[PDB]
Amino acid sequence: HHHHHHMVHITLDRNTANSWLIISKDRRQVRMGDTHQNVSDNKERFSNYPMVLGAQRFSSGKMYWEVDVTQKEAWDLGVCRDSVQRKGQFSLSPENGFWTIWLWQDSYEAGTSPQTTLHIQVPPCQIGIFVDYEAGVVSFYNITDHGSLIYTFSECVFAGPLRPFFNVGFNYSGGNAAPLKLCPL
Ligand SMILES: CC(=O)N1CCN(c2ccc(Cl)cc2)CC1
């Protein structure tokens, strides 16, 4: 792909984070803590899952960023509506305002309803995410495999401002403590 020139500098929004997340001082890295991180509750925080939003809101244009997923067993990545549900149980789908892919139990899947199997020969250490607001497109790229396409959501109905979306996943196994990191431009 040739989307690199639409690179944007994403930072994480502490106020949206699940209360067990630890965000670095530079707001570029997030990981699961072993306990509640001693923050007050608020209506923005994701309650049920280890999720956080980027601070940036997008309503036009073309945007590209990259996320490091090295040595994680489970994670979700993509974009979502600013108005997504924060509290309680929900599935990641375009109907609920999410355009995402994930790793879970040694398989990669796109967050359609129902979910779609992905075909990845080279497990990615870094993921590129491309959003074309006007075209209604969200695409995912395998940076470890020379930028090969993972998945394209097309005919997207964004229906609002978009935010970068992250889920570091639970760490029941003791093998998923590693962070998500926003990679430098
Ligand atoms: C609990 C803690 O402080 N940890 C564990 C997770 N860590 C980590 C960083 C990068 C990568 Cl690739 C893998 C794992 C940092 C140190």
Side-chain angles (χ1 to χ4, degrees), residues 1-184:
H1 72 86
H2 304 291
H3 297 312
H4 306 92
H5 59 110
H6 301 296
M7 185 68 88
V8 295
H9 184 79
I10 301 305
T11 61
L12 299 171
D13 183 345
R14 303 187 159 286
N15 283 337
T16 68
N18 177 280
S19 62
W20 287 43
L21 295 185
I22 305 170
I23 292 167
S24 58
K25 176 158 57 183
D26 66 2
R27 295 184 315 105
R28 301 275 284 171
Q29 311 192 21
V30 57
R31 63 186 180 85
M32 185 54 159
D34 286 336
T35 191
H36 187 295
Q37 293 306 128
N38 202 34
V39 292
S40 58
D41 211 355
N42 70 51
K43 63 195 191 176
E44 296 179 71
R45 294 197 188 289
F46 289 99
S47 58
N48 285 48
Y49 311 106
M51 295 167 175
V52 61
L53 305 187
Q56 289 71 36
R57 283 51 154 6
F58 301 126
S59 285
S60 66
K62 294 173 177 187
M63 285 72 56
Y64 178 77
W65 64 95
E66 290 179 358
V67 185
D68 194 299
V69 301
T70 299
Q71 82 146 90
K72 292 193 65 56
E73 299 175 341
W75 51 261
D76 316 325
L77 287 174
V79 290
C80 63
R81 296 182 187 145
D82 60 354
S83 56
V84 294
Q85 176 186 347
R86 308 307 171 82
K87 309 302 184 180
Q89 297 168 91
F90 55 88
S91 54
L92 295 177
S93 62
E95 304 100 275
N96 289 341
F98 298 92
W99 297 266
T100 63
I101 68 171
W102 64 72
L103 173 61
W104 171 250
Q105 303 194 163
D106 209 20
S107 72
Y108 300 91
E109 298 173 326
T112 52
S113 185
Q115 69 264 31
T116 301
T117 297
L118 301 172
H119 298 97
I120 300 187
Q121 175 65 10
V122 176
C125 300
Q126 296 90 32
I127 299 292
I129 301 174
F130 176 66
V131 179
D132 184 336
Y133 199 99
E134 276 65 36
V137 168
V138 183
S139 291
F140 297 85
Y141 299 93
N142 183 345
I143 303 314
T144 308
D145 184 43
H146 313 286
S148 53
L149 183 67
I150 296 171
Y151 192 81
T152 291
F153 290 91
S154 71
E155 318 188 276
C156 299
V157 179
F158 296 137
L162 293 176
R163 295 184 69 180
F165 174 80
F166 307 86
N167 185 354
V168 297
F170 295 101
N171 187 29
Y172 293 110
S173 66
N176 198 37
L180 296 173
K181 306 191 192 173
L182 284 152
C183 311

